[PDB]
């Protein structure tokens with residue numbers, strides 16, 4: 032059976048990620064863009080604009096935390112829908128791990144919708160930690176060959192960039208920018224932590240390269256009063272969601288891409304990272320064409 | 336590897352499922368009432384019924400209602416998602432069972448049936464509904480679902496006898512939900528006899544007619560392009576639904592009888608349920624601990 036190379040470029044918004052995925056493709060390679068048309072029209076009306084307004088009305092003391100949460104949470108569901116459908120449709124085509132016959136470059140991974148942004152909004156106070164763990168419990172099983180590229184960019188440059196690379200409905204909120212950057216840095220450490228054999232349950236009381244301190248992983252965000260029982264321990268339901276989190280992240284192949292450079296520099300840097308990435312076989316011979324069409328149809332219908 | 340038997344008692348609420356299950360190498364995992372009332376959020380059922388009421392009364396709009404209603408389904412289904420997640424690794428291939436697990440509801444009640452009924456009640460968008468559908472976990476081997484049977488008025492009698500905290504006796508919601516489970520049963524038989532929704536879709540414009548399956552609910556205007564075509568994103572979500580439901584094993588329990596009988600009935604259906612092996616030697620004890628701990632912590 033032919034082989035497939037899947038690469039999900041992810042990380043905080045505003046680093047020039049979407050531009051370099053396109054440059055890469057401009058060079059048997061297909062792109063799955065951000066489903067902007069779904070966010071703007073098909074799933075709901077101006078979801079991004081709705082998200083920024085709600086957070087703003089919250090920070091302004093114009094709505095309550097509960098009003099904000101109800102709105103922020105439903106908005107997250109609309110944002111992640113195209114990501115879940117894509118994963119569920121692609122799943123039965125992915126075979127065991129292995130020039131690929133096909134290279135699929137995705138603009139973000141389901142965890143951006145089911146973990147990272149919801150965690151950042153929790154930090155921003157417009158979502159509850161229980162809702163964040165409900166999304167995490169729904170993260171789909173990690174398929175073989177899940178290569179994820181996370182980006183790095185100094186904060187001052189990112190700030191400067193953001194004042195440029197905004198989004199229709201987006202308001203420049205640097206508290207949110209800081210939150211999302213911290214959430215993705217914790218993600219990176221968590222994968223490291225897990226692959227070095229870390230056990231969050233063993234290290235709970237304590238709340239490439241060497242094994243990170245659990246306090247430097249995502250597990251640290253879930254030490255909130257709402258999830259702790261009278262005896263000070265986490266309720267079993269919340270703890271099992273962390274077991275799920277650990278299970279999902281430990282089989283992923285994470286890489287860091289430096290965005291503090293020109294678009295062409297980023298493309299070439301990503302191109303070399305692409306050599307040491309895990310491929311998989313496809314489950315059937317006609318998987319490649321079928322997969323080619325899914326990406327192109329998704330792109331055509333939702334790219335914007 | 337020892338064998339396990341999972342049984343998910345599902346269907347519209349208020350038919351006597353727990354009355355029968357509590358009269359029943361076998362653990363029972365109750366519904367997560369404490370999570371709904373306290374752990375996940377404060378009084379989730381009250382919030383759900385109050386919001387619909389307000390919308391019914393015109394005190395709020397369809398959009399305000401949808402945001403609150405959708406957000407609440409997330410709290411309602413959480414314990415079911417984690418449970419399926421943590422259990423999945425232990426389930427082996429199709430196979431007296433070492434253990435029998437009687438679950439109070441399957442994730443599809445939370446990620447498909449209730450959201451669908453709420454859409455049918457005007458307080459949930461069909462796009463939000465297909466997002467929950469897209470997240471339904473893969474159907475593990477040996478997934479046996481028991482659905483209820485009961486004439487509407489006896490069901491209304493039964494419902495009146497057991498309101499949950501914050502619930503308001505809504506006959507429109509009772510019909511919506513009954514409709515959804517009826518369609519659900521027809522949908523499984525449709526898929527099992529070889530039905531292809533994409534092929535039978537035009538009909539909306541030996542197996543049940545697609546008009547009597549869950550597919551008919553998604554011929555909703557919000558999901559269609561100007562030419563009437565379903566957008567591919569939604570079509571892909573319908574492909575997932577078809578995939579998840581076809582491999583389920585459905586069993587019908589007549590509730591229109593006595594608790595002794597209903598309970599007797601449940602035990603008889605057990606003979607045609609499919610068993611599976613567990614994945615490790617230590618799977619049985621761990622699955623046992625999981626069930627007792629879920630019950631102890633979230634069963635009220």
Ligand SMILES: O=c1[nH]c(Nc2ccccc2)nc2c1ncn2CCCCO
Nearest residue numbers: 044079082110111139143144148152198
């Ligand atoms: O609250 C938020 N949720 C999500 N979810 C999300 C889901 C899938 C892919 C990308 C983002 N994204 C947010 C939010 N605020 C700003 N953004 C970034 C918006 C621009 C993403 O291009």
Ligand SMILES: O=c1[nH]c(Nc2ccccc2)nc2c1ncn2CCCCO
Nearest residue numbers: 348383408411412440444445449453499
């Ligand atoms: O909007 C609703 N959503 C759900 N979701 C739900 C989630 C998991 C298990 C059962 C139901 N349940 C609802 C709703 N209204 C009434 N009920 C019934 C509550 C009592 C179930 O016995």
